[PDB]
Write a protein that binds this ligand. Structure first.
Ligand SMILES: [Mg+2]
Ligand SMILES: [Mg+2]
Ligand SMILES: [Mg+2]
Ligand SMILES: [Mg+2]
Ligand SMILES: [Mg+2]
Ligand SMILES: [Mg+2]
Length: 50
RNA sequence: GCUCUAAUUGGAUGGAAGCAGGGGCGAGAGCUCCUGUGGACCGAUUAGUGACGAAAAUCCUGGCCAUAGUAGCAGCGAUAG
C-alpha cells in the first residue's frame, strides 16, 4: 500500500510505499507475550532477611 | 475472594475506604444496594504478580467474661492494746 507523507503545516506533500511488514498478520498473543517478558525483565529481586 | 504491577476505562468532600444495622441477587465461594457513622481515598475489565483465604495444631500474641466480692490479709512462745 501507499502512505501519505505530511509536511510541518499538515498538508499532504507526496507519498511513499507502506513497507511490507505493515502487512504482518496481527498476533495479539505473541505481542502480549513479548510485553509480559519485557515487563518481567525489569522487576527487581527481593526477599526477607534470611 | 485477597495484594501489588501493567494496559483499557470509571467513581469520590454534592462524601472514598472501613465499621454498625438493614434491603436485593447467586446452589455457593461471594456480589450488590439503603440508612447511620466515617472524613480521604476507591474500583471494573483484561493480562500478570504472590509473604493470597483458618474453628482446630496442650498452636502464637493481645484483649476479655465466668470463677468472685470468693481464697488470703488468723495459725509461728512476740495473741496488744
Ligand atoms: Mg538457609
Ligand atoms: Mg478494559
Ligand atoms: Mg481444619
Ligand atoms: Mg491467652
Ligand atoms: Mg466458690
Ligand atoms: Mg497478751
Amino acid at each position: 500500500m501507499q502512505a501519505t507523507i505530511y509536511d510541518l503545516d499538515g498538508n499532504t506533500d507526496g507519498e511513499v510505499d507502506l513497507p511490507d511488514v505493515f502487512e504482518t498478520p496481527v498476533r495479539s498473543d505473541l505481542i502480549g507475550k513479548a510485553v509480559r517478558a519485557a515487563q518481567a525483565n525489569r522487576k527487581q529481586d527481593y526477599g526477607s532477611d534470611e
